Amino acid sequence: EEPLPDRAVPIYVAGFLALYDSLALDPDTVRAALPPDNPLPINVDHRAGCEVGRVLAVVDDPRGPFFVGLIACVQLERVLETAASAAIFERRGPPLSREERLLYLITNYLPSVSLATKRLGDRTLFAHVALCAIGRRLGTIVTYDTGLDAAIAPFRHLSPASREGARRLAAEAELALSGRTWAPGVEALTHTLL
Amino acid sequence: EEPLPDRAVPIYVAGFLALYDSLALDPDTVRAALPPDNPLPINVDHRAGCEVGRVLAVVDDPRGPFFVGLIACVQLERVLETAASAAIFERRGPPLSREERLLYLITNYLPSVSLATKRLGDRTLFAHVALCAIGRRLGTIVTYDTGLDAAIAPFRHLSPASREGARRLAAEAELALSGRTWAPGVEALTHTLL
């Protein structure tokens, strides 16, 4: 089809991976695996082959484990566009630019995330974060944005200490991923999603 | 199944029905049909039988026609719950209450709306507002909330004059609908959605 864009639109995702009781995840086991030994990848529908990003930071918070991630995948943008073309387009207004079209699509088609942990039997308890396709899996709500601070801003309930640690941990982690894209495959993503 | 709740959770929806060029809808034709002669109903996927609410107010704005609506439908809440049970539930945390469960579901499953107009050939140009099922139709993004002011608040781009006219027009229109629910039918909604 049309030619793949040369650079991926960087997408930042933020949200709570879990919420504490006011029982599977309690604050004590979360702190045991608080700093992940290995970087937690971001995939689609828990399929390791469909890796589209990387978790930038996970911070403990009184509400629950809060995370920030970076998604850099031209092929995910193309596949979501293909799904959008399979639906009746009734949006009234001027065409959105490349960045807000991607935000419009990934928020509606991948509205939640799911945290994967190792089996029950600092620590390696955290495994990966999965983008959940709507109508397939229902996880915790996230926000998508083209800015790091912008992705965290709508979460007013986060304590200022957790917010600060998140954006400083995410900034230094984003730096190690300088100029890194993800290419799981257009057909690989289409099979999982559509 | 489980018994239908006796009272519907009132849901308020807000957003832009269309956006002006910086060509189908220009500001001049919008003002011609600015005050609808008849109340614009809210339905699902443009099917008149699946009426679930009522548009409370439509205000002209430099960005575009902005609307506020009320959705009061126990059966829509039940059907969306049935769709949620058909997906893998992976949300980590305590169970959401009845109100935020409904908000969680209607935002993810019905993320956009579409404005219906009469054919091309104050005025009756505006017909109804349709809740668009994700993966079926793609319309303009809306916000859902359990409060009238809360539904309008995230739209910071709205001019303060349009915001004021919207909440005063919506408040008096909501009053005429005192204690009115919508019952399109559980099977009617299931056929359209699932």
From Swiss-Prot, chains A, B:
Instruction: Describe the reaction catalysed, as an equation.
Output: Cleaves -Ala-|-Ser- and -Ala-|-Ala- bonds in the scaffold protein
Q: Where in the cell is it found?
A: Host nucleus
List the disulfide bonds in this chain.
none
**Signal peptide location in the record?**
none
Spell out the catalytic residues: H46, S114, H128
The UniProt transmembrane annotation reads: none
**Top-level taxonomic group:** Viruses
Biological role stated in the UniProt entry: Protease that plays an essential role in virion assembly within the nucleus. Catalyzes the cleavage of the assembly protein after formation of the spherical procapsid. By that cleavage, the capsid matures and gains its icosahedral shape. The cleavage sites seem to include -Ala-Ser-, -Ala-Ala-, as well as Ala-Thr bonds. Assemblin and cleavages products are evicted from the capsid before or during DNA packaging.
Subunit text? Exists in a monomer-dimer equilibrium with the dimer being the active species.
Q: What name is this protein filed under? A: Assemblin
Annotated gene: UL26
